Structure 1
Amino acid sequence: TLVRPKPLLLKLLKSVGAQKDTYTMKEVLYYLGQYIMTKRLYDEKQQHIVHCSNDLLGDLFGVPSFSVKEHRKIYTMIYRNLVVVN
């Protein structure tokens, strides 16, 4: 599947070195991961919990925090911020 991130998600992804406009779901996940890692959007205490209440990430996703294990919930949140392309 080829996806075109919407402007705000595009800006967030491009800010961590993503060069293109069209991505695969694995590329969005990778670049979203680089974003979490650089900005340090997690606690040493709980590695699996992303804390994003005060970040553009939580705004686009619509949640204060989420578990890295909640794959289905993460896709739902990402899907809202993209358009599927040819």
Structure 2
Amino acid sequence: NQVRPKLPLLKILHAAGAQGEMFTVKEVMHYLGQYIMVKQLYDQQEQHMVYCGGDLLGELLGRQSFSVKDPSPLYDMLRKNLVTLA
């Protein structure tokens, strides 16, 4: 249940304070949330929206925006960008 993130995602996690390069999925989600907070990508007035266009996160998602009410695009990105070790 350890995952290794592809390099661009790893860079994002480190930017949010993560250390090392092996993580649990729980850790990955924690640090991604923290990244969104530190980079000010959330909408303060519409707190379901993340505006990730023009950030590396948007590049990974292939999106300008996503809603936390629909985790599908984020989870699809994570499936593609995480390597699960035995």
What TM-score comes out, normalization by structure 1 length? 0.91
| C-alpha RMSD of matched pairs (Å) | 1.2
Q: CA deviation at 1:28?
A: 0.6
In structure 2, distance between residues paired with 1:83 and 1:61: 17
| 2:75 counterpart SS class | helix
- Hey, what does 1:30 align to over in structure 2? 30
| 1:54 counterpart SS class | coil
Q: Which moved more, 1:72-81 or 1:13-22?
A: 72-81
Q: CA deviation at 1:32?
A: 0.2
Instruction: State how 1:6-85 maps to structure 2 within 5 Å.
Output: 6-85=6-85
Q: Which moved more, 1:17-26 or 1:48-57?
A: 17-26
Consecutive unaligned residues in structure 1, runs of 5 or more: none
Identity percentage over the alignment?
53
- Hey, what does 1:4 align to over in structure 2? 4
Deviations 1:24-78 (A, max 9, x none): 1111110000100001102222101100111000001111111112233321111
Consecutive unaligned residues in structure 2, runs of 5 or more: none
In structure 2, distance between residues paired with 1:17 and 1:84: 22
Deviation >6 Å, runs of 4+: none
In structure 1, distance between residues paired with 2:46 and 2:84: 33
What TM-score comes out, normalization by structure 2 length? 0.91
